[PDB]
Amino acid sequence: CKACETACPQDAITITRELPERKDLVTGEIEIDKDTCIYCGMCEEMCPVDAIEIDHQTPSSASPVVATDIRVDEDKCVHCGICKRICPVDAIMQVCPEVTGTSY
Amino acid sequence: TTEVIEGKNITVERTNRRLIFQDCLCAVCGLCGEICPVSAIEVNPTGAMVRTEQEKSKIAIDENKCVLCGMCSSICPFQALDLQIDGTSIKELAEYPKIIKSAEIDDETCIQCKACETACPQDAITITRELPERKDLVTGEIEIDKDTCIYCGMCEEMCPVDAIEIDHQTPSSASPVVATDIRVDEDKCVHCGICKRICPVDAIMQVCRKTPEVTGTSYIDPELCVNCGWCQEICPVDAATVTKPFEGELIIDQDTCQACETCVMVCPCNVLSFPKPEKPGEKTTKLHKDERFCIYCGACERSCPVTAITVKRNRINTTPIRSKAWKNAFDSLLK
Amino acid sequence: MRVILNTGRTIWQGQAIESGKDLKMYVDAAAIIQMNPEMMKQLGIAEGDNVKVISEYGDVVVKAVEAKEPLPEGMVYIPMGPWANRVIRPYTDSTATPSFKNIPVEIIPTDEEVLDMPTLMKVYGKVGQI
Amino acid sequence: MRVILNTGRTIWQGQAIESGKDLKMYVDAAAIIQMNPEMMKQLGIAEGDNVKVISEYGDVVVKAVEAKEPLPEGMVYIPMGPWANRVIRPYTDSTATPSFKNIPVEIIPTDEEVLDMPTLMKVYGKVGQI
Amino acid sequence: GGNVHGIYDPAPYFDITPAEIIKGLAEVNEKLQLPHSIHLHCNDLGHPGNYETTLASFDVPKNIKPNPATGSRDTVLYATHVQFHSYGGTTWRDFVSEAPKIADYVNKNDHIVIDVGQITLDETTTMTADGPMEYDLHSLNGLKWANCDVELETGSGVVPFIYSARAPVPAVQWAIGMELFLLIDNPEKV
Amino acid sequence: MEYVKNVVCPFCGTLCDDIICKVEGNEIVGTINACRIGHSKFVHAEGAMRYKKPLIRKNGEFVEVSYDEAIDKAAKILAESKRPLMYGWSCTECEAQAVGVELAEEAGAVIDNTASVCHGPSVLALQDVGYPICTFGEVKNRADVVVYWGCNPMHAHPRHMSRNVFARGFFRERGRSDRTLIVVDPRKTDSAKLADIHLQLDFDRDYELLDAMRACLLGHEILYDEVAGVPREQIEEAVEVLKNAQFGILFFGMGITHSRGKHRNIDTAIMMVQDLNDYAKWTLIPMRGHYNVTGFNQVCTWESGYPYCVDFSGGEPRYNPGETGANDLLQNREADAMMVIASDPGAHFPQRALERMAEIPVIAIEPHRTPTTEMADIIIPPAIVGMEAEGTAYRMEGVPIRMKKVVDSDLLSDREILERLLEKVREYKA
Amino acid sequence: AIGLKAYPELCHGCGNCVIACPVNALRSPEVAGGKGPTDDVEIIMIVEDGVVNIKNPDLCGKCGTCVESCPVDAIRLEEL
Ligand SMILES: Nc1nc2c(c(=O)[nH]1)N[C@H]1C(S)=C(S)[C@@H](COP(=O)(O)OP(=O)(O)OC[C@H]3O[C@@H](n4cnc5c(=O)[nH]c(N)nc54)[C@H](O)[C@@H]3O)O[C@H]1N2
Ligand SMILES: Nc1nc2c(c(=O)[nH]1)N[C@H]1C(S)=C(S)[C@@H](COP(=O)(O)OP(=O)(O)OC[C@H]3O[C@@H](n4cnc5c(=O)[nH]c(N)nc54)[C@H](O)[C@@H]3O)O[C@H]1N2
Ligand code: SF4
Ligand code: SF4
Ligand code: SF4
Ligand code: SF4
Ligand code: SF4
Ligand code: SF4
Ligand code: SF4
Ligand code: SF4
Ligand code: SF4
Ligand code: SF4
Ligand code: SF4
Ligand code: SF4
Ligand code: SF4
Ligand code: SF4
Ligand SMILES: [K+]
Ligand SMILES: [K+]
Ligand SMILES: [K+]
Ligand SMILES: [K+]
Ligand SMILES: [K+]
Ligand SMILES: [K+]
Ligand SMILES: [K+]
Ligand SMILES: [K+]
Ligand SMILES: [K+]
Ligand SMILES: [K+]
Ligand SMILES: [K+]
Ligand SMILES: [Mg+2]
Ligand code: NA
Ligand SMILES: [S]
Ligand SMILES: [W+6]
Ligand SMILES: [Zn+2]
């Protein structure tokens, strides 16, 4: 808990801890239909952990599109369900380790 | 007939008739210089005015030659020249020939995706949208039992949105505690459940238990819009409609072009580009065009030092021109 | 060089006004310019060297001393007195109170001497009125 | 002032070595210290003023010039040549290559003159060996 | 950063196969009446199962008649270091010698001379104009790698290599070269 | 006025071979195509000393002597020395360099070139981890990513960018527009001003930045939020630009050979370039300095087996940079005599090495007045390679080009001087 | 009027402008590919005696490509 490390008046204690990875404290599945996606950017803006990334671009006559890809980083996602609810074309499907350390 | 210089802008006035040139809207296409029946206008080099720093205005209007006819104001595809007669612009006077063009967004069809705002080469579109507050996209209840809490700090560290705050302190004999309070900001919480699962003493109670409409507006600035049609083509629901001033053709000689990029930078409609090869060893078109976005202004041709790109103009969209002087001037721009 | 002139009290200027404004100790306490050692290196001067101070409002010669109360970069300090009041902003902005603090001034080294109290006041050219 | 000394090429030092290291143009191209205008302001110097550069390894007098290729804060640049090589780190770290770049040095303004090429080389005291 | 696999696979852009390069250069060689023949280091060097690519390569210039102006050469193809081109199997785990099939081809055909490229079982250095093979060797042993791509012309690579008698692949590689020398009946072809 | 075309420039490692010399009588009075530096080497600057005769130092004065007298005294010094140093070589041609190697064997000398103050750390690195290079035409015709890491070509290799970046190649027909130009330098140099990406990193931290780029390339997390003053997110983005190249070239210079870590900065850059080949075609080219520094290391390697810092004191060649390099031998006071050829250690060595040059006999084979001739006991002037004498030179990526004789000189070539010196040292040794 | 102007005293003779120019590249395949001309040709400017030298100013289209290619502002487009 590290309370003794903070309290020690001589700074004689070292307390460390290895927290579980975020992905192991949530459970769910998430998938974006890239053909249905219109690259409106609302999911990317609203995502609370920046798990969604869109490859935005200025269109050119050789590539007449505002973006070339959209991805969800499943290691960052916390399965809050905000993205599926804001999507205006329903392109998103979304559905819903002990602490080790050293004491010295 | 006098003239007033306001930085790079030019005003030619006679007493009433007033011709105003706005340097910031000029694309240096050269059409005003070509149409003037008394050759009162001189247009500076297109590439130089776009690619380098110049103190000069993009055009020069000779007061001693200008007769304030308004042909230059009528032809300008960029709204940079405006002739006013007794305070009213010639675009509001039916006796003056007017080029037929438009650009609009159907607000009932629009879904506020913002693709047209990004694609517009003149930044003429403003799309606003009202997203709901984050607290209205999630539902749940959360509370921390402060008597059970041991202030280990694991929930505060793991919270993905920094909704948890602990008032940490160095203990003293009068206050022998490592912290004095813990709070959850319910407007920030996204009810992910991470905090309740990491808590080593189960001090956190968190439970998950119809979304409002996204409203918005669209606006096309008529002074900045050049009727290129990028909004119409990019729109996923066909909510944008555009009509162009001229019809014509572009001809590129790929072998004469030395890929200096001047025309690509000059084009105000983003018609021209340098495609990148997809795989190693593949070859691409040196200078790529997409005429769906072209307005046949002629700036590209004017800018090219090797004359590798030429513009043909087949029609200028107006109702039949009554004045012979105006009909002859407009006809001279066809080629 | 261009600097910002701040003015006000020193305990030494206080002791000097109460001892006597006609004594040498008043010239030693108030005909001075305090500056950070870095500014003295920029000007190429040492403690005890004289400095010519010029503003839009007047001019004065004062003795340079190292500041014991550190100044922000680009600021100097002349203690309140007739030397400081040769160069600060007289205008009151319709309040009655002049701008005694934070005036832009030009400072350069000089071989000219600091003027004592009666000699400094002769710059105003008092004409007898009785 | 404590600064970091970087050294290397300039097109002007290149033109001078190929024209003649015995000419005045070599002193004008290589007996110089390039500095950002902000550093010249901190030191209280102008372009053309001389600077004394001292390191743990030696000392040299060079002419200050404003850098046309901007430097990061706290860095100066002396073009490669015998003036730079009076002060950079000779040690090779058992590689054969000295530390010609990024050496801590002390810089101050000076009224001393820059030494021409034959005069600078007299500091080594060559003794005839035949 | 690529390579060709087999004799019917073209390089990017040029769109000419290894088989067409070999056949065309053999014809050029005899039109110029050169003293020596074309001198070939085959595609797919050092790979299990490459013996099929090698035998196909040997047949490519067989219908071209030798015509040297100087000397007495009477063969249209010279194939170098054939030990590295005589491998069976599909991976290094099932690797076997196919030297008897290669030697049988040389015994039965009259248009070919070979050299073996015998493993000496030393710590040595590899250096060839086979740039991608050298990079692949560096990827296997992790040792220092040099490369030089020469504009419009060729490439090259250099990697140190230890051929230990106690290691299984070098032991088979030594045996392959011995089989080529000893199973080829006529030393006029070696 | 005659125009001599296809001339090879005897200044930097770019080794331009399209120079046009303007010749009036027997004097090069002008040029075409050569940059400001190349032109300055070709034409004579009014007032600059060009020695017409050999010189010997007496007290502080010099006396003119014949080639016979000067070479005889130089040979006596070399023959009686126990640890002679034969240094420079990078501004002469390969035949003169080969005579130098034979003379170093005869005198039991240490032979070393300017690599020991230049790309010698790159040589140490390539010996440990490798050397993945290409020739200039591959850069021109294929490169879509060009990196200048710790080099300022606009000031030091002035036509390098016009020849390799602005040039329109076979698969890069749009020239500058088909390439992403990256410059890595703590200063905003004139080369960095042309870049698409300028990584203005903290000085002496290239090794740290390269460690982060390599860990990121292999799929690992970067331990710190900022490395060498570059934020984690921008390091990840720079790595993606390199991984997406169709053909990348990493050009590098003194910014990483002279700075903290020296050869280990080059080592980590080479390993990054090698590992990048699992994602994209990548190579590197050291920005070799003098027009023939590369030729010395080629000649010395093919004759002895080692490139520089070569010690022949024991008969067999031995190699130990850090022990047998010019600065090591002078600073550790081991060398008891020094012969300088086509180099200027007087101007370009640190003060600690100059202190040793003041105490030992110095022979300078040099055409002009320099800080080295100010420290010399004997000065022997030669005909200049690329203007008055021919021979091979090697470009920075190993391309050999023959230097031309444009005008005539009454002076001996370096090769001729060295052959006469070799004969006399042999005589004194007998 | 606006035209090409050289400042040879600021010039490095690097050749970026000579190669970047589309008029020069069209007239000389050597220049198109990054070399200085060896074949006799009439181009806008060349590097001569170590600095940029304007030879045929009437061929310049005032596009600004050379200007973007010079980091030391030694070739400009300005009122002549
Ligand atoms: N004008 C001229 N040209 C020459 C020569 C000459 O004397 N004069 N000599 C030739 C020779 S012999 C050589 S080797 C070449 C060398 O040419 P370059 O390799 O370009 O050598 P430098 O100009 O010494 O330094 C290059 C850059 O390294 C940067 N640098 C300094 N510290 C660091 C660092 O920690 N990291 C990084 N990334 N960069 C840093 C400097 O700011 C500088 O701009 O020039 C050759 N050409
Ligand atoms: N502070 C600092 N010092 C440095 C550097 C740095 O970046 N900073 N850089 C270092 C590097 S990388 C290097 S290579 C050195 C510079 O290397 P140096 O070799 O010292 O450079 P130069 O002064 O160009 O000397 C070349 C000499 O050769 C002579 N010469 C020219 N042609 C011929 C010929 O045909 N024959 C003969 N015999 N002589 C000829 C010239 O007159 C000239 O004096 O400087 C090093 N010193
Ligand atoms: S000993 Fe362990 S549990 Fe107890 S206060 Fe220290 S860290 Fe917390
Ligand atoms: S909200 Fe839906 S349409 Fe908009 S970008 Fe995200 S997935 Fe695509
Ligand atoms: S579920 Fe929540 S966290 Fe996961 S991507 Fe969608 S919005 Fe981001
Ligand atoms: S017509 Fe073309 S050149 Fe004339 S003002 Fe309008 S935009 Fe400028
Ligand atoms: S108003 Fe008529 S006369 Fe005056 S410039 Fe425009 S076109 Fe020419
Ligand atoms: S692209 Fe179509 S839907 Fe999207 S904002 Fe513009 S008009 Fe509305
Ligand atoms: S994890 Fe539990 S005990 Fe630790 S601070 Fe948060 S609520 Fe308190
Ligand atoms: S539920 Fe998730 S978002 Fe809300 S406080 Fe706990 S950890 Fe933070
Ligand atoms: S027509 Fe072209 S310029 Fe007008 S709003 Fe649509 S995209 Fe913008
Ligand atoms: S067409 Fe002319 S302007 Fe456009 S890129 Fe080609 S050469 Fe340059
Ligand atoms: S491509 Fe069409 S719109 Fe663009 S500059 Fe040329 S004529 Fe005008
Ligand atoms: S770049 Fe180097 S080789 Fe080419 S001309 Fe200039 S100095 Fe000579
Ligand atoms: S003008 Fe600029 S780009 Fe042209 S050669 Fe001179 S320095 Fe290089
Ligand atoms: S302005 Fe354009 S045409 Fe004129 S020289 Fe420069 S690049 Fe060539
Ligand atoms: K504590
Ligand atoms: K977000
Ligand atoms: K836009
Ligand atoms: K947190
Ligand atoms: K729990
Ligand atoms: K559409
Ligand atoms: K044109
Ligand atoms: K036969
Ligand atoms: K010269
Ligand atoms: K001229
Ligand atoms: K410029
Ligand atoms: Mg090749
Ligand atoms: Na200060
Ligand atoms: S060098
Ligand atoms: W060098
Ligand atoms: Zn082979």
Report the residue of chain E nearest F245, measured CA to CA.
E1
Say if strands F2-7 and E112-114 run parallel, antiparallel, or are unpaired.
unpaired
Measured CA to CA, the distance from residue E107 to residue E185 in angstroms comes to 6
Q: What's the CA gap between C102 and C88, in Å, rounded?
A: 8
Instruction: State how far the Cα of G75 lies from the Cα of G6, in Å rounded to an integer.
Output: 5
Q: Which residue, of B188, B209, B230, is where some domain finishes?
A: B209
Our separate counts of H helices and E strands in chain E read 5, 6
Nearest CA to E38 out of E82, E81, E85, E75 is that of E75
Mutate to test the interface with B, among G26, G59, G62, G79 (most CBs of B within 10 A): G62
**F174 close to B (CB below 8 A):** yes
Subunit contact F357:D124, Cβ cutoff 8 A: yes
Whole-angstrom Cα distance, residue C65 to residue C48? 6
Distance separating alpha carbons of residues E190 and E179, to the nearest angstrom: 12
Torsion angles phi and psi, residue F238, rounded to 5: -60, -40
Q: Do chains B and E touch (3 or more CB pairs under 8 A)?
A: yes
Q: How many other CB atoms are there within 10 angstroms of residue C19's CB atom?
A: 12
Strand-pair category, F130-134 with E145-149: parallel
Any residues with CB less than 8 A from the CB of D82 and at least 6 apart, and which? D30, D117, D120, D121, F346, F347, F348, F371
Q: How far is CA C40 from CA C54, C67, D46, D48, D107, in A?
A: 17, 10, 17, 21, 16
Same domain, F135 and F195: yes
Distance CA B187, CA B205 (A): 17
- Hey, is F173 helix, strand or coil? coil
CA-CA distance, F222 to C81, in Å (whole number)? 62
Work out whether strand B9-14 and strand B17-21 pair parallel, antiparallel, or are unpaired. antiparallel
- Choose the final residue of a domain: B44, B74, B98: B98
Residues of G in contact with F11 (CB under 8 A): none
Q: Which of D87, D106, D103 is nearest to D6 (CA)?
A: D103
Closest alpha carbon to C17 in C79, C60, C85: C79
D82–F346: do the CB atoms touch at under 8 Å? yes
Q: What is the DSSP letter of F394?
A: E
**Is residue F226 classed exposed, middle or buried when 0-12, 13-18 and 19+ CB atoms within 10 A define those classes?**
middle
Over the Cα atoms of chain G, what is R_g? 11
Alpha-carbon gap, residue F60 to F374, rounded angstroms:
10
F393-to-B138, F121, F204, F314, F340 alpha-carbon distances in Å: 74, 22, 33, 30, 19
Q: Which DSSP symbol is given to F33?
A: S
Tell if the CB–CB gap between G13 and F36 is shorter than 8 Å.
yes
The two structure tokens encoding residue D28:
């004008």
The nearest alpha carbon in chain B to A56 belongs to: B118
> From the CB of B19, is ligand 6 less than 6 Å away?
no
| A101 within 8 A of A48, measured Cβ to Cβ | no
Contact call for B154 and A41, based on CB within 8 A:
no
Whether residue D42 and residue C44 make contact (CB cut-off 8 A), yes or no, is no
Determine the 3-state secondary structure of B164 from DSSP: strand
Residues in chain A with CB shorter than 8 Å from the CB of B180 are none
Cα G72 to Cα F152: distance, rounded to the nearest angstrom? 13
Residue B39 burial (C-beta neighbours within 10 Å; 0-12, 13-18, 19+): exposed
- Residue pair F122/F273 in contact (Cβ under 8 Å)? The answer is no
Of F252, F286, F320, which residue sits at a domain end?
Answer: F286
Q: What residues does B216 pair with on adjacent strands? A: B129
Judge whether F21 and F7 are in contact, CB under 8 Å.
yes
Tokens of residue B23, six digits: 């340097």
How far does CA F81 lie from the centroid of its chain? Answer: 28
B190 alpha carbon – ligand 20 mean position (Å): 13
Selected residue of F8, F20, F159 to mutate for chain G interface (largest G Cβ count, 10 A): F159
Q: Which residues contact G3 (CB under 8 A, 6 or more apart)?
A: G57, G60, G62, G77, G78, G79, G80
Query: How were these coordinates obtained?
Result: X-ray
Distance separating the N- and C-terminal Cα atoms of chain F: 52
- Is residue F371 domain-shared with residue F318, that is, in the same domain? yes
State the maximum Cα–Cα separation within chain G, in Å, rounded to a whole number.
Answer: 33
* Closest residue in E to B282 (Cα–Cα): E13
Distance between D42 CA and the closest CA of chain C, angstroms: 7
DSSP B286: S
Which of these, A55, A72, A51, lies nearest to A63 by C-alpha position? Answer: A55
How many distinct structural domains can be found in chain B?
A: 4
- CA dist E135 and E139 (Å) reads 6
Sign, CA torsion C122/C127/C128/C129:
negative
Q: Which residues of D touch C42 (CB under 8 A)?
A: 42-44
CA distance E47 to E133: 10
Q: Annotate F252-277 with DSSP letters as a single string.
A: E-HHHHSSTTTHHHHHHHHHHHHHHT
Other CB atoms within a 10 A radius of the CB of residue B319 amount to 9
Q: Please name which of F156, F128, F135, F117 lies closest in space to residue F257, comparing C-alpha atoms.
A: F117
Tokens describing residue F184: 């890595």
Asked if residue B218 lies in contact with residue B279, where contact means CB atoms within 8 angstroms, the answer is: no
Asked if residue F148 and residue F112 are part of one domain, the reply reads: no
Determine contact, residues E109/E184, Cβ cutoff 8 Å.
no
Distance, CA of F117 to CA of A6 (rounded, Å): 54
Distance from the alpha carbon of residue F135 to the mean position of ligand 15, in angstroms: 25
Of B153, B176, B274, the CB nearest to A2: B153
Task: Confirm if B131 and B175 have CB atoms less than 8 A apart.
Answer: no
Question: A–G contact (≥3 CB pairs within 8 Å)?
Answer: no
Q: For ligand 1, is residue D19 a contact (CB within 6 Å)?
A: no
Distance CA G8, CA G22 (A): 21
| Long-range pairs, C17-24, Cβ under 8 A, ≥24 | C21/C117, C22/C117, C22/C118, C24/C116
Supply D53's token pair.
């550069």
- What string of DSSP letters covers D31-71? SEEEE-HHHHHHHT--TT-EEEEE-SS-EEEEEEEE-SSPP
Distance from C-alpha of B62 to C-alpha of B33, rounded to nearest angstrom: 11
Sign of CA dihedral D95, D100, D105, D111: positive
> Alpha-carbon distance F321 to F310, whole Å?
9
Residue E17 is inside which H or E element, if any? none
Contact F338, F361 (CB under 8 A): yes
CA distance B159 to G27: 66
**CA-wise closest residue to F266 among F276, F277, F252:** F252
Instruction: Show Cβ contacts of residue B53 under 8 Å, excluding neighbours closer than 6 positions.
Output: none
Q: Establish if F128 touches chain E: CB-CB under 8 angstroms.
A: yes
Interior angle at CA B302, CA B296 and CA B306, nearest 5: 120
3-class DSSP state of D19: helix
Q: Which residue of G has its CA nearest to F32?
A: G48
Question: Residue E75's closest CA among E19, E26, E18?
Answer: E26
Close Cβ partners of B172 (under 8 Å, ≥ 6 residues apart): none
SS (H, E, C) chain G: CEEEEECCCCCCCCCHHHHHCHHHHHHCHHHHCCCCCCCCCCCCEEEECCEEEECCHHHCCCCCHHHHHCCCCCEEEEEC
Residue type, E88: G
Q: Is B153 in the pocket of ligand 9 (CB under 6 A)?
A: yes
Residue B225 and residue B104 in contact, taking contact as beta carbons nearer than 8 Å:
no
CA B57 vs CA B5, B184, G1, G4: distances in Å: 10, 60, 12, 18
Give the Cα separation of B29 and B77 in Å (integer): 9
Ligand 20 centroid to D23 CA: how many Å?
66
- Do residues F289 and F89 lie in contact, with contact meaning Cβ atoms separated by under 8 Å? no
Q: Mapping DSSP to helix (H, G, I), strand (E, B) and coil, where does residue F304 land?
A: helix
- Does residue F255 share a domain with residue F273? yes
Contacts of residue E38, Cβ cutoff 8 Å, sequence gap at least 6: E22, E25, E26, E29, E61, E76, E77, E78
Closest CA to E46 of E179, E136, E146: E136
- Whose structure tokens read 């930097």? F12
Residue D113 is given by DSSP the state P
B119 and B217 co-located in one domain: yes
Distances (CA, A) of B234 to B113, B125, B271, D85, G27: 11, 13, 14, 63, 41
Length of chain F: 430
Residue B274 contacts G where some CB pair is shorter than 8 Å: no
Which residue type occupies F330? Answer: L
Which residues, in sequence order, are bridge partners of residue A102?
A16
- Residues of B with CB below 8 A from A3's CB? 150-152, 178
CA F268 → CA B286, F129, F197, F251, G64, distances in Å? 38, 9, 21, 14, 40
Alpha-carbon torsion F58, F62, F68, F74, what sign? positive
- B263 contacts B273 by C-beta, under 8 angstroms: no
Using the Cβ of B265 and the Cβ atoms of chain A, whether some distance falls under 8 Å is answered with no
Record the tokens describing residue E156, joined without a space: 């090259």
Q: What angle do CA C47, C50, C53 make, to 5 degrees?
A: 120
CB contact under 8 A, E1 and B282: no
CA distance B82 to B76: 9
Find the helix packing angle between F94-107 and F414-429, rounded to 10°. Answer: 10
Q: What type of residue sits at position E124? A: T
DSSP state of B275: P
End-to-end CA distance of chain G: 6
- Would you tell me how many other CB atoms lie within 10 Å of the CB of residue E66? 16
Strand partners, C108: C52
Q: Which of residues 15-74 of G touch B (CB under 8 A)?
A: 20-23, 25-26, 32, 60-65, 67-68
B164-168 and B179-184 beta bridge pairing: antiparallel
- Nearest-10 Cα torsion for C18, C21, C25, C29: 80
Cα of D48 to nearest chain F Cα, Å: 22
Q: Which residues pair with D109 in a beta bridge?
A: D51
Instruction: Work out how many CB contacts closer than 8 A connect E with F.
Output: 47
Beta bridge partners of E158: E127, E146
Q: Give the contacts of B227 (CB within 8 A, at least 6 positions apart).
A: B77, B101, B102, B103, B242, B243, B244, B245, B295
C-alpha distances (whole Å) from D71 to each of B32, D23, F202, F284 are 48, 28, 11, 27
Rounded distance from Cα B263 to ligand 23 centre (Å): 10
In terms of residue numbers, what domain contains B235? 99-131+210-243
- Domain span at residue F90 reads 46-117+287-430
* Residue having the nearest C-alpha atom to atom 8 of ligand 15: G14
Within a 13 Å sphere around the CA of F70, how many CA atoms are in the beta-carbon half? 27
Does F136 reach chain E within 8 Å, measured CB to CB?
Answer: yes
- DSSP line for B183-226: EE-TTT-----HHHHH-TT--EEEEE------EEEEEE-TTT--
C1-130 folds as Barwin-like endoglucanases (2.40.40)
Same domain, F208 and F304: no
Q: The tokens of G51 are what?
A: 């600095």
**Which residue type occupies E123?**
E
CB F411 within 8 A of CB F382: yes
- The 3 state secondary structure assigned to chain C is CEEEEEEECCHHHHHHHHHCCCCHHHHHHHCEEEECHHHHHHHCCCCCCEEEEECCCCEEEEEEEECCCCCCCCEEEEECCCCHHHCCECCCCCCCCCECCCEEEEEEEECCCCCCHHHHHHHHCCCCCC
Same structural domain, F3 and F76: no
F174–B286 CB contact, under 8 Å: yes
Displacement of CA G74 from its chain's centroid (Å):
10
Alpha carbon distance F14, F163 (integer Å): 9
Show the DSSP H helices in F81-135 as ranges. Answer: 94-107, 120-129
- The residue from F286, F316, F348 where one domain ends is F286
- Locate C77 and state its tokens: 């300090």
Residue with token string 């084009």: B267
Say how far apart CA E50 and CA E58 lie, in whole Å: 13
CA angle E81, E87, E89 (to 5 degrees): 170
In short, whether A13's Cβ falls inside 6 Å of ligand 3 is no
For A26-44, the three-class secondary structure string (H helix, E strand, C coil) is: CCCEEEECCCCCCCCCHHH
Q: Identify the DSSP state of E44.
A: S
Give SS3 for F385: strand
Instruction: Tell me how far apart the alpha carbons of residues F58 and F63 are, in angstroms, rounded to a whole number.
Output: 7
Amino acid at D15: Q
> What's the number of CA atoms in the CB half-sphere (13 Å) around residue B43?
24
Hey, is the C-beta of D42 within 8 angstroms of any chain C C-beta?
Answer: yes
- Looking at the fold, whether F409 and F269 belong to one and the same domain comes out as no
For chain E, the first-to-last Cα distance in angstroms comes to: 35
Domain count, chain F: 3
